[PDB]
Amino acid sequence: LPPLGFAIAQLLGIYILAQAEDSLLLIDMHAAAERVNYEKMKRQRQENGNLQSQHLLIPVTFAASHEECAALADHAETLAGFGLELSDMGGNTLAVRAAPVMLGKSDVVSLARDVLGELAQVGASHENRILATMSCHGSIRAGRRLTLPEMNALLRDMENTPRSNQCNHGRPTWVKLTLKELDTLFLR
Amino acid sequence: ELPPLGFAIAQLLGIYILAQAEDSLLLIDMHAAAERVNYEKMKRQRQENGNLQSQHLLIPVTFAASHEECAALADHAETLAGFGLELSDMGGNTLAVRAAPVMLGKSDVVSLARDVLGELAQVGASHENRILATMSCHGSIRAGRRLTLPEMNALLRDMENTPRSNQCNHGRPTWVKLTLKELDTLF
């Protein structure tokens, strides 16, 4: 059955343990979820030009810096490019109107901030950097408590992800220990 | 807080219990840990009490036996009670198990009776360890039996409560610990 096997448990919040044919896999879940996210976004930005938003049911308002308000004013277009709709409603309060479908909300503010934060820097092809930053913000990350099928869904996505096994920063996203090597841990 | 072997989170490849202790993963060699635990419980009961405390089955378990097993029963009924086992002949080479050691999880009491009877065929008290060794393979944790997370924890608590739980016969560790830092090092 599948190369990344089946989820068996989650560890000190950081790891997914899975059982593959004759092996244990330890998947760095955050680093893995990021990679999937990044690629799925890099693809969409390539195939539909923009990322698709979702018109928030309850517009989440938040206290912004001037710097952030300025970024919104200068890059309204670009933010729609990344499936983010925001409006500036005085006294440094911003409102999130719409967030990307493919990040299933969660601290929408924290996402908004980060992108504003990235756009602030531009003073184009800042794309990869921005998506990498956006890649950290999906359903799985920082918080934990996944179900086994949630974990399975991830390993499935990973199997369809054209640089699984690599975080935004070079490291592997999983380790495999074969039956042979496991046995070797118990060496006399 | 947490006990040293932590809590079971899964079973792996039929062979290992995975546990989470503080800041670490443990892998336990389930069979080796169980054998070791069982041996020590028993050998200690034998030196403390002279004999293993047996427990009666509500419905005796019958099985077809070889002539050699029957002759073994006839010769060593007393020795067998010393090992917490009681059987009845019954005739036509059928034996019944009436009682099996407390320290075991049944386990096919038939399998156990057969192994111990077999071990008794080859003697005519210096066999102690040999016998307890064989018996130790027959608790509730053994071969392709899938455990619940509470059963897995009960073995871990047992280990913590057993001397020499850390090594098997060969002097092989029974468990291995990987800390958060070590885990990250493998990346």
Numbering used by the authors:
A (entry chain B): 464 to 586, 592 to 656
B (entry chain A): 463 to 586, 592 to 654
What does the article say, verbatim?
To answer these questions, we have determined the crystal structure of the C-terminal domain of NgoL (NgoL-CTD). The structure has been refined to a resolution of 2.4 Å with a final Rfree and Rcrys of 27.3% and 22.7%, respectively and the quality of the final model was confirmed through a composite omit map. The structure of NgoL-CTD shows the presence of an elongated dimer with dimensions 100 Å by 40 Å. Six leucine residues (L474, L475, L480, L487, L489 and L650) from each monomer are oriented into the interface leading to the formation of highly hydrophobic surfaces that come together to form a very stable dimer. The metal binding motif in NgoL-CTD has the sequence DMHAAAERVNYE, which aligns well with the established consensus sequence of DQHA(X)2E(X)4E, and extends from residues 491 to 502. The motif folds to adopt a helical configuration and is part of the α1 helix. Therefore, the active site in case of NgoL-CTD can be considered to be a composite of these four conserved motifs. As reflected in their B-factors, sections of monomer B appear to be more mobile than corresponding regions in monomer A. Overall, the two monomers in the crystal structure of NgoL-CTD show dissimilarities in structure and a significant difference in mobility of certain stretches and therefore the two monomers are related by a pseudo and not a real twofold axis. The inverted dimer, where the two active sites are located on opposite lateral faces of the CTD, provides a potential structural basis for the observed nicking activity of NgoL.
